[PDB]
Symmetry: D3
Subunit: 254 residues, 6 copies
């Protein structure tokens, strides 16, 4: 590989919690040059279609600072048109966070997740999912510690990774060059207990076989395991009770 | 199932070509109550980033008439905000059509695919992919017959189907009620030669196992086979040469 | 005329009711190559300025699929700017439907009319008015049959036709070439009892005389009569009681 | 009538030319409380579809200051959505100006007409057409005087008036109360030589007869004559040569 | 100076009240060729964040007719994007009006200020502030005279002027050419009692000294005094009681 | 003061350069809880109105992540309307950067400055100006080091600070509570050589005196001096030649 990384090998991962002071939960996560600030903020209200239904909600906002992929990514603000890509990813991130939380026990409140890509080199949405989880878990633990809620209703860890087929090679965690050069690429969202939350595989003018898909899904699930092993070092859990470990930062030894 | 259909059974499928006179290719396809007008029109130009590169292009526009799911689906016109869902599906449809055509041999022109959902009851995007293929193939055959291009550069058939897990049952081709009630659901885009172009599986606050995913991918590939067997009755192909059969309409015998 | 049609002669008209299953009323109407899907759906509510005023409402949405006039008509969605033309026609269609119904007796509900032009070759808005009436009448008859309302409060038939002056010839029902080549053209919306609901005459850089206008208004009213004679074959009316005839389709014998 | 005006009687009309210094042509016209600033500015260019075609163009922009009809008319700016009504009227005004000018002889330039309603009490679009003509004529006369063009290619005067049926009375030049209370109302755009440029008649949930339409078209044409007699006092024309009279202001004696 | 005006000399100022009939207050103010219609209209309501708080509000809308600076200033309507400049000025004008009124005593109602630039040649926002005050004062005096409110809660006069450094000369009240050619320019909003409400000084790629700023602020305050002396001729005030003088128009003698 | 800070005392300032790898220049600057990522990226092109004019350009984009002031600041993306506040600040930041650079010597290229507020507690735009300068200087030094340009055409340091009058106290560098509670507040943009680039003072329904303004401008200029003394520790300059010092981070000793 370009950067001398093995095919079934992730880039250097780094997750730093308590990145910012104001949000209930926050972290700066990085997969190589890809960097994402993930924050979780509690809004003491709920969408209207949920009112009175004894449940909370989680929603996500994603944004890519104009300086991404060492190119230009002008925001959906001072430009006009609003990309349907940003929404696709926001919906993804929201779906991952919601799958991981028992919203029943969160109360009639909303956790507003914000993923700000401050540097892009491929895999920015999976890095955002992986980091967003940390921020959401921390925010729920914070809410508990503040007595706003009884327990810490977090179902399981959640992480994501990309995998692709490049020049007929199956690669894990693609940077931006490998991804643009890919025949087939995909995104997997998995849980701590080894299950899956989402898998999107797309042929880029090339088609693939069911078996190629399984090979990829297998390498991805291994990537999710490594990412979740990192995430696990930040918590001390017992019988569904979540507390933060004393680590403020975890990183892959590579 | 609600409608008395088996679990591994599709709804009544119907594809009618030559639905309209003006487009090079067009059809009305239906999966049960879900109905979609698919048209393919040739625009004698190409996007700017493609100019001079000796290649053609295919792009898709999708729209859902205000009367969908027996509810309201006001267009992205007299409303303002533009859904990122419509774009997700348009990109999908475009990716499927492009995978199926050798754009190199189409010339510096663009095939504009339009999918108009005139009635929605689940699986509207897969019905659109299945129908869009027919319209695109017909348009390429038309272009050939008009002498605009030498051959009929169509690589293979392309169809799509949805599958899901509902009350722990794995169901094929979900209508709107089964889909809203689903724990896990997915969309598969496959080719005539049995390969895959795209697969998107999403847990709806439930997670699934790799094996459950394979079971689903297996039922889906069988659905794609049936859909492609229908599509095949509309063409007579030999050594990469495509002509239309004399059928103007094909339907599953159910 | 280009198509060998007399000057005071309409193109082949065709109206097919029950085109779709979900809407209370629906039809596919065609004036030559111009084709429009017209549906009428009941929304169990009313605009706010009408609440509590013991009255119902009718509103229309019009849209022209990207493949119109064998050219490009990209929707007011994935483009941005919203044409003031679409609104002009929607307001027109709404005004025609409302003139024909005694909204007092419809209840505090709204009939949402949707006109989807699936093929355009001139006269698409008059075809939409003519077809929209059928869909609205059917929807009111349906509402009655479902016991939602007591009577079938339809005041009279409503249809529309275009007429123009081309190379100093006064022509009825203009296709797209005759219209672009016209010095003066107009749209008339008339009722079954021979009255008028709307008439818009526009000089296209040419001016006309009051007498030329009367000649045109006269030919148009004859076109409305023929269109209404077709529409009449679809209903059996007596003392303000409306039922559908057994025809599912009516067409001009030409 | 509310204001003691006869039925076939206009409100006090006033046209003041040279209202502003910067535009080639400009005036403040008033029909009762309805007041409109009309300016005509020359832009030394043409729309792209006209380039090289040896012709000029005229286009109009209409706007209604937030304080109209003694109510609120917030602009299509700090609100978002853009009304399809403003466009309907802009297209109307542009069509009237273009019908009156021989664009062939104007050169490859554009006359930008701006109608700013500074006070609204009915008939604001007809007042704008009547006033816009004065501004356009003046601008063409100015262009001639500056030697930019050879002749003053103005075909004829152009004015507009509204008429309606209120409580079964046919009234000329409706203010805002008469218009809201009208069963039928219309707008006529006529020329100096007694011809017509545009006529739009709309039943407001009431239908009318061809003869009622003629009665209205007759009263309107008389209103156009009076308005054009005022406009004529501002020019001295001979053999298609236009010069301004010494009047800076003209008003109906009432 | 270009127009033969001294450096510490304003252009000819003119303020005409009762410009229009419908608004509670209105005037046409002019600074040289720069002309602005300023109207004040009472809306019998308040923004939601103010409800029940026993206070009124003042908000402003600013717009520049397409014919400004003898160039093109197409509105924020039939263009799309909405300038952040118009908002900057609207907020400014609103802040000036609010500083001058004791909103506590105005009641739970809103004064809607509209500034319509009908001709631009520099200093259009300061002319708008100066004129808007007159319209607001008149509207409050009107409200009092109609018995809607007890007193006339106007704190003090408010006016504005621009000043700049051009070719190292400090000039008062810049027209459009002096402003575009300026190294430093600013806007001051002052009160009758000689105080300040707002001051914005901007280096245009040139920086300035604190002392240069004071020199400018000094010339500006003198310009505000002259403008307020004009404004004062339109009112007769005593012990916080405001009545209009018999002047309908005031102008600088120059 | 709330946080025990003196009145003429800044919050703890921190500037970290080389914050990110991809941009030519970048830093994370902080004024208390207010934190802003400032990046400078070179775009090898120029706006059209500048082409061929032998000059470069600098433009800025500002954005406030949804989690600001421990509240909600949803971007100008998935919301619709685009704030005129963001533009006011972007224009400000661009004006400050341009005043500090000799664009003549930068070449026909553009420096794209991006200020991303990742945490807001008052003074976010002044923190952005102060930090943006560092990123721009670094980017120019980088461009020089890469041989793209001959010299390092930076005219002088540029920094900004806010000051206000709160409960009649004149305070330097206001946090969010002091600012909302302020009678008068302002923003000053000054240079290393002690000059000024911009000063905006606004009465918040209170007016102030010229002398109060001078007192404030005096405290602000002292704040700019301290901020510039920090900035200076990051560079080693001689005869207009700029190199970076070995500091990667500088902070006020407080």
């Amino acid at each position: 590989r370009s950067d001398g990384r093995k095919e079934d090998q992730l880039r250097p991962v780094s997750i730093q919690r308590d990145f910012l002071e104001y949000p209930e939960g926050s972290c700066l996560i990085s997969f190589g040059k890809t960097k994402v600030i993930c924050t979780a903020s509690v809004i003491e209200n709920v969408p209207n279609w949920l009112k009175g239904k004894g449940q909370g909600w989680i929603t996500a906002e994603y944004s890519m600072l104009p300086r991404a992929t060492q190119q230009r990514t002008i925001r959906e603000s001072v430009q006009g048109r609003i990309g349907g890509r940003t929404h696709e990813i926001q919906r993804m991130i929201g779906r991952a966070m919601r799958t991981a939380v028992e919203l029943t026990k969160i109360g009639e409140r909303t956790i507003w997740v914000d993923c700000d890509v401050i540097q892009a080199d491929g895999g920015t949405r999976t890095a955002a999912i992986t980091g967003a989880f940390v921020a959401v878990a921390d925010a729920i633990i914070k809410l508990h510690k503040e007595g706003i809620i009884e327990e810490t209703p977090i179902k399981d860890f959640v992480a994501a990774v990309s995998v692709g087929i490049v020049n007929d090679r199956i690669l894990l965690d693609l940077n931006f060059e490998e991804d643009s050069a890919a025949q087939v690429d995909m995104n997997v969202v998995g849980t701590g207990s080894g299950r899956l939350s989402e898998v999107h595989t797309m042929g880029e003018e090339y088609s693939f076989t069911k078996d190629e898909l399984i090979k990829m899904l297998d390498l991805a699930q291994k990537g999710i395991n490594e990412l979740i092993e990192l995430q696990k070092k930040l918590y001390v859990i017992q019988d569904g009770k979540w507390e933060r470990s004393e680590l403020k930062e975890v990183s892959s030894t590579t």
